[PDB]
């Protein structure tokens, strides 16, 4: 009969699928091992909750990032530092980038979701990538100065 997988089962289906098995395969193996559960009309609805909610927060979170992408690809973050010519070297790391962003624009970002190899050595015009959401890219204008 039809049952749903509570765990990925190769050559059978990925977790969450309705799948047709011999009844004996379900009754004496899959089911009493937590590997699947009956695709009863009740469970088929309980599944739907997860599917519904999960994709809802996930579509939520993607748009919840979109509110950032518009303001950040618009603006520029200016970070003044004690400087000489084109060198002075400071703790200007994603940490300070975020701190400088909280106090200047109020907005708060995760200094680890920020793409940056090493702390900025030189004064200059820098374009960082912020990836707050694995789908939504963000090109950040940051300018280090006097």
């Amino acid at each position: 009969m039809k049952v749903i997988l509570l765990e990925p089962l190769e050559n059978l289906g990925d977790v969450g699928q309705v799948v047709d098995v011999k009844p004996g395969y379900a009754r004496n193996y899959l089911l009493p091992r937590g590997l699947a559960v009956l695709a009863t009309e009740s469970n088929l609805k309980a599944l739907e909750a997860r599917i519904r909610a999960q994709a809802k927060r996930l579509a939520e979170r993607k748009a919840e990032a979109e509110r950032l992408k518009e303001i950040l690809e618009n603006l520029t973050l200016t970070i003044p530092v004690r400087a000489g010519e084109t060198k002075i070297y400071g703790s200007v790391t994603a940490k300070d980038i975020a701190e400088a962003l909280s106090r200047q624009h109020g907005i708060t970002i995760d200094p680890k979701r920020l793409a940056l190899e090493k702390p900025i050595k030189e004064l200059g015009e820098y374009v960082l990538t912020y990836k707050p959401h694995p789908e939504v890219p963000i090109q950040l204008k940051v300018s280090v100065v006097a």
């Binding site: 009754r27 009956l38 009863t40």
Partner: protein, 97 residues
């Protein structure tokens, strides 16, 4: 085989009629009974062990109603059952029926 615990199915008396000769249907003279006698027909009773409230319950049912046993487990999942003897549980499951 006694009674099916789910369907109440139980053995009945049925005749063994013994015939002979060509059917009239096939242009034969007609069937002749050479004997009638009583036998019994038993329900296809089978054993279905199952685990409800972690305790292991064992039903004895016709093959016909085996899936109904598994329906009952599904339905007793919404139920206080813990610390009940296996008999206590089974009696409760059948109450759902």
């Amino acid at each position: 085989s006694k009674v099916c615990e789910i369907s109440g199915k139980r053995p009945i008396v049925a005749n063994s009629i013994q015939r002979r000769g060509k059917a009239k249907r096939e242009g034969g003279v007609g069937k002749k009974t050479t004997g009638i006698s009583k036998r019994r027909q038993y329900p296809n009773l089978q054993k279905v062990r199952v685990r409800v409230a972690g305790q292991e319950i064992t039903f004895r049912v016709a093959a016909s109603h085996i899936p109904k046993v598994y329906e009952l487990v599904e339905r007793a999942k919404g139920l206080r059952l813990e610390g009940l003897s296996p008999k206590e549980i089974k009696k409760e499951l059948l109450k759902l029926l």
